[PDB]
């Protein structure tokens, strides 16, 4: 088994649902996909349903 974790910085683009300014809820969606392989050689499955925040500040 291989267990690999590289750090990265991401700049996602998410639409701003600005109706109740200023207090409101922003819904930002970010996608992960393998640009090289489709579902013919690899298959992607999530380990845990929720993004872990053990290291969050």
């Amino acid at each position, epitope marked *: 088994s291989i267990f690999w974790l590289p750090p990265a910085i991401y700049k996602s683009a998410c639409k701003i649902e600005v*109706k109740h300014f200023p207090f409101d809820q922003q819904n930002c969606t970010m996608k992960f996909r393998s640009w090289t392989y489709d579902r013919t050689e690899i298959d992607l499955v999530l380990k*845990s*349903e*929720v*993004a*872990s*925040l*053990d290291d*969050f*500040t």
Partner: antibody, heavy 118, light 113 residues
Framework: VQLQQSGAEVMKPGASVKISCKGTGYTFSSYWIEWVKQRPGHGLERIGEILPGSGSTNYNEKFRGKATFTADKSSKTAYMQLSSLTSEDSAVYYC????????????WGQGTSVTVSS | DVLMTQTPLSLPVSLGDQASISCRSSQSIVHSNGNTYLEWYLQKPGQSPKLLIYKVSNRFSGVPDRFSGSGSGTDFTLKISRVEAEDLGVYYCFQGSHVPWTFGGGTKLEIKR
């Protein structure tokens, strides 16, 4: 997944009460944990939820200033400092996991009995 | 806070009869996304509450089909087809629209003879 709570707690009125919440089998520091107060007579009233990752806390407008939550990241444990206790708050306490706007409330605890008397 | 009104307070029904219970909110609890988020809880004497109906238009994974839920954008109704010896207990509503969240009033449900 599995939840653990503290044993029975008795104390003279006016002092503080600490109850512990342990969660295992999932990502403990990833989503909300909310507690519930059940008076032995009737009804269910909530007390509040916390996010064990950050310092995000909120309270119901009726139970403000009565309790203060706290969570640990090293050990998967949640505590609650309780303010001056009156004989109108002797009830059962539940804990549960919750994630807003999505799948939520799939498991519970076992129940913590707090019997305050002089 | 958006308060819940449960009707009736007690609906004694016989074994096998269909029972409907209404749960109304003081305000609109429909979210801007297009889904209404409400939870139904079933509590038995001396045990932790159980789950039967989350996301009313859907059903919980593990509960039999005898329970159903419906209603419009404001009025909600929980329906049971055949009440069994296990269905004794208390119902509870939980609205999931606005912050903070609150519970219902608690609907006592037993059998009748």
């Amino acid at each position: 997944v599995q939840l653990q709570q503290s044993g029975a707690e008795v104390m003279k009125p006016g002092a503080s009460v600490k109850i512990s919440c342990k969660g295992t089998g999932y990502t403990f520091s990833s989503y909300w944990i909310e507690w519930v107060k059940q008076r032995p007579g009737h009804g269910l009233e909530r007390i509040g939820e916390i996010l064990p990752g950050s310092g995000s806390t909120n309270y119901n407008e009726k139970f403000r200033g009565k309790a203060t939550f706290t969570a640990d990241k090293s050990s998967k444990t949640a505590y609650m400092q309780l303010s001056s206790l009156t004989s109108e708050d002797s009830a059962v306490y539940y804990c549960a996991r919750y994630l807003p706007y999505y799948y939520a409330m799939d498991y519970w605890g076992q129940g913590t009995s707090v019997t305050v008397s002089s | 806070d958006v308060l819940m009104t449960q009707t009736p307070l007690s609906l004694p029904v016989s074994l096998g009869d269909q029972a409907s219970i209404s749960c109304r909110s003081s305000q609109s609890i429909v979210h801007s996304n297009g889904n209404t988020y409400l939870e139904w809880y079933l509590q038995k004497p001396g045990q932790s509450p159980k789950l039967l109906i989350y996301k009313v238009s859907n059903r919980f994974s593990g509960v039999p089909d005898r329970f159903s839920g419906s209603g419009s954008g404001t009025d909600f109704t929980l329906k049971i087809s055949r009440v069994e010896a296990e269905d004794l207990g208390v119902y509870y509503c939980f609205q999931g629209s606005h912050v903070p969240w609150t519970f219902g009033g608690g609907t006592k449900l037993e059998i009748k003879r």
